[PDB]
Design a protein around this ligand. Sequence first.
Ligand SMILES: Nc1nc2c(ncn2[C@@H]2O[C@H](COP(=O)(O)OP(=O)(O)O)[C@@H](O)[C@H]2O)c(=O)[nH]1
Length: 308
Amino acid sequence: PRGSHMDDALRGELASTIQLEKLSHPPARFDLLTSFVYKWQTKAALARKVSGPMREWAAELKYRTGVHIELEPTYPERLSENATQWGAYETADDVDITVYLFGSERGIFNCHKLMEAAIQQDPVYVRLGIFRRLANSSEVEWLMLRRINRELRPPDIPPISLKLPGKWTLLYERYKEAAIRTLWEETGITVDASNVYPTGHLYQTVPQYYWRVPVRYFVAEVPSDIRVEGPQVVPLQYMRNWDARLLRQSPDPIDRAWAQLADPATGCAWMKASMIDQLQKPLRGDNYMAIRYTPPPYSNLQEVVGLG
Ligand SMILES: Nc1nc2c(ncn2[C@@H]2O[C@H](COP(=O)(O)OP(=O)(O)O)[C@@H](O)[C@H]2O)c(=O)[nH]1
């Protein structure tokens, strides 16, 4: 019942081999979905590529074929263990996951080959660090957004995410291609692929959070004078039309900094790296921007951005 609701929410933002096993009927726990049902016994290293933290790719597979993807840890009691067929999993990739498919065999056949191609790639989150240089200052300003995540979310996703632009790679989409397209979807800024530079990737997960995906990072300079329109895809899902008087007095530092630098008409804000890491210091430690958005030397840009 929760899996469907999350797939319905992503509909607005949508525009070596797999051994399936047909099941006579589904287990009683999955009858409400029941329409055939096929099972795929795999690991989280593979099942993560057809689901996603917010069911990004499980919803696209439904948008494509009409099949419903349902995932469950095969032996979830092992995820409650600290220290073999039983005990704590070594890594998240090793977590046994059982995937269920619901729909017509026509739609299941289409999704099956889509899934066999999905598990071949590396689907990740992308963040294109958009920055501009200030004539009066020496440091750069980065464009920040605050997305209001939905109620149906995994426990590792906050209610509001202070983020730089960027979403996720669609099925068969590539890193830079996703970073540029998702940049416009969240900001409305058009950046050329020759000015986008990869700055690194991060993957930190635990077995209990088997769904977590790597994050590929990019940076690109924007002209200091530019019309930042804000989110054009699902704009209601971002912090907008807020009230600067009362939020300025919120006990959250993010919130106060948002009331002072954010524009409620666009939901966007320009922040310096020293300000972003100060905001991320109590949650992430030091060097939040430097760890993620340090340009490669061939960009001839780590001099300009200031992290280096
Ligand atoms: N949000 C999110 N973060 C992840 C996921 N998987 C890994 N991470 C970690 O997120 C850290 C950096 O996150 P950040 O750049 O602040 O993006 P954000 O956490 O999604 O706002 C990295 O150390 C990654 O290991 C995921 O599926 N979702």
